[PDB]
Amino acid sequence: QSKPWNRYRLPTTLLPDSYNVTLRPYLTPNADGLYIFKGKSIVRFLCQEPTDVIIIHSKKLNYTTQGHMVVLRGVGDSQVPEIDRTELVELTEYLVVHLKGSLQPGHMYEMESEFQGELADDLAGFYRSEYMEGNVKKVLATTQMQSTDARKSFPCFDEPAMKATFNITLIHPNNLTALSNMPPKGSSTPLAEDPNWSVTEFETTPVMSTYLLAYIVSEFQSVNETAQNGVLIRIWARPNAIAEGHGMYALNVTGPILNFFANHYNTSYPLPKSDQIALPDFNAGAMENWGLVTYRENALLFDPQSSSISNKERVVTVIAHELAHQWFGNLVTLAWWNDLWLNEGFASYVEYLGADHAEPTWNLKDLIVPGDVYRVMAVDALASSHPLTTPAEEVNTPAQISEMFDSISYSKGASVIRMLSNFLTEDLFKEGLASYLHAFAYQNTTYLDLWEHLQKAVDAQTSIRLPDTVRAIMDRWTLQMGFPVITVDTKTGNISQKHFLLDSESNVTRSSAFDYLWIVPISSIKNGVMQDHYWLRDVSQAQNDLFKTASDDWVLLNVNVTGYFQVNYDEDNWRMIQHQLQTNLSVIPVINRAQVIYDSFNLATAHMVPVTLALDNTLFLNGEKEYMPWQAALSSLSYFSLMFDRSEVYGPMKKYLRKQVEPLFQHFETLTKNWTERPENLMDQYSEINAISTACSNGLPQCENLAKTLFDQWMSDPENNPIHPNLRSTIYCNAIAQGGQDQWDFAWGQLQQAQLVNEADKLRSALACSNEVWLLNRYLGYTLNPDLIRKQDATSTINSIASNVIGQPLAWDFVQSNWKKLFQDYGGGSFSFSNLIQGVTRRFSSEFELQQLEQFKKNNMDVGFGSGTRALEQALEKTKANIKWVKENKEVVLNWFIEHSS
Ligand SMILES: *[C@@H]1O[C@H](CO)[C@@H](O[C@@H]2O[C@H](CO)[C@@H](O[C@@H]3O[C@H](CO)[C@@H](O)[C@H](O)[C@H]3NC(C)=O)[C@H](O)[C@H]2NC(C)=O)[C@H](O)[C@H]1NC(C)=O
Ligand SMILES: *[C@@H]1O[C@H](CO)[C@@H](O[C@@H]2O[C@H](CO)[C@@H](O[C@@H]3O[C@H](CO)[C@@H](O)[C@H](O)[C@H]3NC(C)=O)[C@H](O)[C@H]2NC(C)=O)[C@H](O)[C@H]1NC(C)=O
Ligand SMILES: *[C@@H]1O[C@H](CO)[C@@H](O[C@@H]2O[C@H](CO)[C@@H](O[C@@H]3O[C@H](CO)[C@@H](O)[C@H](O)[C@H]3NC(C)=O)[C@H](O)[C@H]2NC(C)=O)[C@H](O)[C@H]1NC(C)=O
Ligand SMILES: *[C@@H]1O[C@H](CO)[C@@H](O[C@@H]2O[C@H](CO)[C@@H](O)[C@H](O)[C@H]2NC(C)=O)[C@H](O)[C@H]1NC(C)=O
Ligand SMILES: *[C@@H]1O[C@H](CO)[C@@H](O[C@@H]2O[C@H](CO)[C@@H](O)[C@H](O)[C@H]2NC(C)=O)[C@H](O)[C@H]1NC(C)=O
Ligand SMILES: *[C@@H]1O[C@H](CO)[C@@H](O[C@@H]2O[C@H](CO)[C@@H](O)[C@H](O)[C@H]2NC(C)=O)[C@H](O)[C@H]1NC(C)=O
Ligand SMILES: *[C@@H]1O[C@H](CO)[C@@H](O[C@@H]2O[C@H](CO)[C@@H](O)[C@H](O)[C@H]2NC(C)=O)[C@H](O)[C@H]1NC(C)=O
Ligand SMILES: *[C@@H]1O[C@H](CO)[C@@H](O[C@@H]2O[C@H](CO)[C@@H](O)[C@H](O)[C@H]2NC(C)=O)[C@H](O)[C@H]1NC(C)=O
Ligand SMILES: *[C@@H]1O[C@H](CO)[C@@H](O[C@@H]2O[C@H](CO)[C@@H](O)[C@H](O)[C@H]2NC(C)=O)[C@H](O)[C@H]1NC(C)=O
Ligand SMILES: *[C@@H]1O[C@H](CO)[C@@H](O)[C@H](O)[C@H]1NC(C)=O
Ligand SMILES: *[C@@H]1O[C@H](CO)[C@@H](O)[C@H](O)[C@H]1NC(C)=O
Ligand SMILES: NC(=[NH2+])NCCC[C@H](N)C(=O)O
Ligand SMILES: [Zn+2]
């Protein structure tokens, strides 16, 4: 019998009722330079089963309590046992209170403690964040409890299912504002011991999880709205950001998104107010703390004068995501971190629904396909993938919990939930979802509970019929990794499924309970007309006349890619689809025009079609106006650019892409009235952005000339930037590529005085587009200078230079030569040797380059490679793969491009 304090999961003998917590950050260092916070807490808990030990989480807290580390009292007239001793057990992050007798079932106890910790700049628990306002370094105090860091701010039963109410008090400088999950009780009062401090008490939370607590002390200011039901909505930011109006977009969209979700969930927003706060350099991106959601600035703030449309899209979707959680995840909470995929998958899906409500003309819901589906399919089509579900008993340590937060959890979670909603229909999905939220409000669940409530909705109607239970179907998609390729022979209507792997030689060693067979919902369109829905059962092979065609007809599966799978056809059907896209593309839904490209390039990779069939699938693009199919092509061909852009293949490739994109360029030139006005909706703006990028990077003279004119014009009038933020990255880059030290020095000046990160980013990246070796080398020479290049930007900048075909050898030489700055930046901040290595070696595709990477590896003796040790192995592995791919593909690809370029 192991001792319970040496087990990672808490006992279930004691359950918390409510906490009082008082925190007091000291935002002035103690002159050895240490920042601290002090706290006092009382937890009231109920004894379920007798026990002579109290085990509660504590991390990096020193205790100053009088006596033992806690004082223990009975509630009401309960007696309490004497404390034997209190100890801290660091490994399992416990405060352990050994008692001289047993606590008694049904009795409640209160445990009081006093403590302090470092207010570290470490983005964990209660922590400090430093930023600049003019001359002054400002310091604020804020929180990040997710996942297991509430215990770093005060002792608590720090597991998501052990919910409780919290009464938070902040003691803070009297001229700063204090925020928490709930509204303040009233005006702050002076701290009697020192009236330079004030005390702000907050209203009692609902019953909630510790990982969702938040509290913040800052000089921040807000923009406000009161919704019709009296819910107060505020956006908080740096005084200067608020004054510039950068909070207005967030405020604009928040009301509509909250309204959408209350109706979507059939459940009122469960709090009296909604605060969202933009934090400078919040590396975690955003966190859904209940009533007080935190964001990195660039995720919440928006500058209409400098921000592109894609920035706007990022703001509305991240807001929709975090707000989605205020019901799904916060009101009803998954019992344990092994079910994180459901929480994060659900939010990652409905973020598009919420954002769509706020921006109904943008067709946002479509973007889940490129954004999540095909993104996660890249990693889920590997032997090294993993099922959405993990046994709860395998997820114990804080490191194991952190591993839950990955692409599979978010993006495959989103993809499968979206599939589920689609085959249930949204109305039916919403009924079960509402039933689930009502039944489990303020409590905890597993994914099985959601399946059960969805099944209840299915059972209560007669319209939607499923081939099996919701659970049995979703089991196929959650208990085994990966996804099928569905292959159709349209001569017979034979249809098959098999586990899809990009590497046709891969060995899958992870076994599945289902032999990698799925139950697959299959929609289809024949000659542009919707067909009856079909389910492929858990069989290798089936037949249906739905998928049988005449000679002059075509069929296409997985309308709008609602289903988490990819599709192959016989060549005849492929050609018929190709001629349709050639002659009238609007018969096929825009998402499917993209699908044909996405799937066919993946199939070519996996040797299931020839690479020329994938290329053939791009031939229609010369008539394509819309964003997604072009995006499909650009994403699929970026590897071809990477392998071939230094080879004889590249001229014919550029020529073919010039041919394809010219009509699109001409279309927008007219539509935008000579580039003076952007297209109206988001998709068309995105298409314009890509069309200009593609034209300019492939050397279309008309785009090159546009880029030179605008940049000339900006240089003659530096304070009036004539280039729309949408087009800035391309126009900057192409213009600097055409120009010399005049253009380069000017853009450098503008980088030095850029007050906005997004604009600094674009300039930094464009500066790497110069075609002068000496400019790129001098630039590389700056990247280690923290004066001229922020350290957090150094590897990014080197990678951008590596990306330049002329900068490739320069960056590689520079990284090798100054590698002996591992002993200067595995200590002086983090870095990302890993991201540096991948970027600089990304192109390597010959034996000779592999010989160089091996030779570079022989500075193994000392310094080593740090956090990129694993990366350098991945680079030798990827170069081998690239060598093999280029040998296989070079001849067939060269001759296709020659043939199709005119
Ligand atoms: C968790 O925090 C709560 C808020 O501080 C505590 O409840 C408060 O206790 C206060 C002081 O004990 C009470 O305020 C006043 O106290 C004086 C003592 O001199 C009493 O006579 C007054 O009756 C009382 N004043 C008023 C206007 O009620 C509060 O009653 C009380 N606040 C509440 C209940 O909202 C909890 O006790 C504390 N929990 C634990 C376990 O200590
Ligand atoms: C929680 O308690 C810890 C242990 O008491 C504290 O960590 C200790 O900080 C000490 C004081 O800052 C350090 O001791 C010495 O302090 C003198 C004067 O400040 C320094 O000149 C010395 O460098 C330092 N001693 C040595 C050997 O270097 C300790 O380094 C450190 N002790 C341990 C065991 O980690 C925490 O400060 C305290 N935390 C908070 C937030 O209160
Ligand atoms: C938050 O929502 C607000 C209300 O919908 C938006 O306010 C709108 O800002 C528009 C963009 O500046 C304005 O449109 C036009 O602006 C120029 C200025 O000269 C002119 O073309 C037009 O005269 C003007 N619009 C019209 C219809 O004439 C609107 O003035 C304004 N609308 C309202 C109702 O005030 C905010 O833009 C929005 N904030 C963000 C960041 O999106
Ligand atoms: C946090 O504050 C709440 C609200 O004041 C406290 O809830 C009260 O609990 C007391 C003692 O159990 C009851 O007598 C009252 O009926 C409760 N009031 C309300 C409005 O619910 C709660 O006890 C506090 N938590 C702690 C640890 O003291
Ligand atoms: C809140 O009070 C503090 C102290 O009065 C102010 O912070 C000082 O500001 C000056 C410049 O204005 C700095 O040089 C000092 O070093 C600061 N003191 C400390 C201890 O940091 C602060 O400006 C006030 N803030 C507001 C919003 O009124
Ligand atoms: C949850 O949804 C139900 C069903 O839409 C809502 O109750 C219905 O409200 C409509 C609106 O006029 C009535 O016509 C129906 O008769 C109601 N049905 C029932 C069974 O009551 C309810 O308003 C929603 N609740 C929330 C909080 O959004
Ligand atoms: C975790 O959630 C479950 C529900 O999924 C909670 O169990 C419920 O407790 C409430 C209030 O005591 C009862 O009304 C229900 O009968 C329970 N439902 C069950 C047992 O299925 C459970 O209390 C939560 N766990 C913790 C530690 O709070
Ligand atoms: C379509 O599937 C059917 C199997 O249901 C295939 O036809 C069978 O092929 C086997 C293999 O020799 C014959 O022995 C069976 O008698 C056939 N079944 C029949 C005719 O009902 C057919 O080959 C498949 N067509 C494809 C894959 O294009
Ligand atoms: C496939 O996706 C398209 C969107 O790309 C869907 O078209 C939308 O349909 C909804 C509801 O009918 C309309 O409100 C939108 O205005 C449509 N948008 C566009 C751009 O046409 C289409 O309904 C989807 N097809 C299927 C079978 O689900
Ligand atoms: C996987 O096993 C098969 C032989 O059964 C082989 O073709 C292949 O080379 C093996 N390894 C890899 C990494 O593909
Ligand atoms: C092509 O098909 C579209 C959509 O089905 C139809 O509206 C249109 O008539 C066709 N366009 C032409 C030019 O025939
Ligand atoms: N990997 C993390 N722990 N990220 C924390 C961010 C929190 C939030 N749950 C999100 O998905 O944005
Ligand atoms: Zn989330």
Author numbering: 63 to 964
Direct quotes from the study:
The most studied member of the mammalian M1 aminopeptidase family is aminopeptidase N (APN), also known as CD13. APN exists as a dimeric 110 kDa cell surface protein with a small N-terminal intracellular domain, a single-pass transmembrane anchor, a small extracellular stalk, and a large ectodomain on the C-terminus. Cleaving after neutral amino acids, as implied by the “N” in its name, APN degrades peptides that are involved in different physiological pathways, including pain sensation and mood disorder by inactivating enkephalin, as well as regulating blood pressure by cleaving angiotensin III1, 5. The seahorse-shaped ectodomain of pAPN contains 4 domains, head, side, body, and tail.
